[PDB]
Design a binder for this molecule. Structure first.
Ligand SMILES: [Mg+2]
Length: 363
């Protein structure tokens, strides 16, 4: 009995609402999307939040489908490096100095974020299960400066430690092309440090001490990993509680596959990053799907796939259809097949280990 837990479902993405390049092509089909995923053994998924507004959208979307989704949906709350300007070329570069000069607005935004996390963490049965996406993305300095990324990654890490309930939440971390700086910031929280200055006045919102340290059981999930073998070793050595998320983007080249082979199997989590990270014929991963198609009775794609302008007419019918170019959580099974072949770990074995590990982290 196979079970998948997609830790990277971008369910708020406009493509899942029928919008492509800013144009609506079909009615939103996310309930049918969830039905497709359930049919392909996806039991649970974590819906990503990337800003205060997007986290609020995720809260509301998950609530809106609680009685319609055959998947159990959880979500994150956090502000991604894309979006840290909401706490605050010429404009982006100017912001850090302006925040330091007058931190009052940022102080209020950090309070708003803390308050949201606490509100959502309240109920015993809450769908809010992880703080993130937070981290660093040095491929996106056109969205935010390095200084703004580093400061607001760190302030969010502090918030995630501010009380006992949040301190236990696993972190859903973003890292792209920023390994050394990402490790440098996290290492201070792994070992512990004292924030005397408290520029953003967080200690006004569990201890007067100013001492920040991750709980020894807090899990640290590095989403959508595509780094080098050297980067991987830096992450694994940071903490035994570092986990590595693997999706189709993590499997594109032979180098990527070699790196994935080195991830300890019990520290590997599976995700689609849907609607992104489709496993394509031009990827080194495809050969394993080809093998499964040929020798193992595997259906690729999992359901008929049509162009975006052809989906709408299919939506009254009972049969389920995908959109060409739009990845989905029902493609978890493809990631699992590839990882199992790359690692020479029996497929059912891999699925079982990843399922149990993911459930322990997120619930
Ligand atoms: Mg992602």
């Amino acid at each position: 009995p196979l079970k998948y837990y997609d830790i990277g479902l971008n369910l708020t993405d406009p493509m899942f609402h029928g919008i492509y390049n800013g144009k609506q092509y079909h009615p939103a089909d996310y309930v049918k999307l969830l039905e497709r995923a359930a049919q392909r053994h996806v039991k649970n998924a974590l819906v990503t939040g990337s800003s205060i507004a997007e986290s609020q959208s995720a809260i509301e979307l998950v609530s809106s489908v609680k009685d319609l989704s055959p998947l159990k949906l959880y979500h994150t709350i956090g502000v991604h490096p894309c979006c840290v300007n909401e706490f605050a070329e010429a404009y982006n570069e100017s912001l850090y100095a302006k925040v330091i000069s007058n931190p009052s607005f940022a102080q209020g935004k950090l309070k708003e974020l803390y308050d949201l996390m606490n509100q959502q963490a309240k109920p015993h049965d809450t769908s809010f299960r992880s703080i993130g996406e937070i981290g660093l993305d040095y491929d996106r300095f056109h969205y935010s400066s390095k200084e703004m990324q580093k400061v607001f990654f760190e302030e969010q890490l502090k918030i995630s430690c501010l009380n006992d309930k949040l301190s236990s939440y696993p972190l859903f971390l973003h890292m792209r092309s920023a390994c050394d700086d990402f490790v440098q910031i996290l290492e201070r929280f792994v070992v512990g440090f004292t924030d005397e200055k408290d520029t953003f006045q967080l200690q006004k919102l569990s201890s007067s001490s100013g001492f920040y340290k991750f709980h020894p059981d807090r899990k640290l999930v590095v989403h959508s990993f595509t780094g080098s073998a050297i980067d991987l070793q830096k992450l694994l050595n940071l903490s035994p509680n570092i986990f590595i998320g693997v999706n189709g983007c993590s499997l594109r080249t032979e180098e990527n596959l070699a790196v994935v082979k080195q991830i300890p199997t019990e520290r590997l989590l599976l995700e689609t990053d849907a609607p992104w990270c489709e496993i394509k014929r031009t990827h080194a991963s495809f050969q394993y799907l080809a093998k499964y198609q040929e020798v193992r009775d595997f259906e690729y794609p999992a359901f008929k796939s049509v162009k975006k302008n052809k989906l709408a007419d299919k939506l009254n019918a009972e049969e389920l259809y995908m959109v060409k170019g739009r990845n989905e959580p029902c493609n978890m099974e493809q990631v699992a097949i590839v990882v199992s072949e790359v690692k020479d770990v029996d497929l059912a074995t891999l699925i079982d280990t990843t399922w149990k590990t993911t459930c322990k982290i997120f619930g």
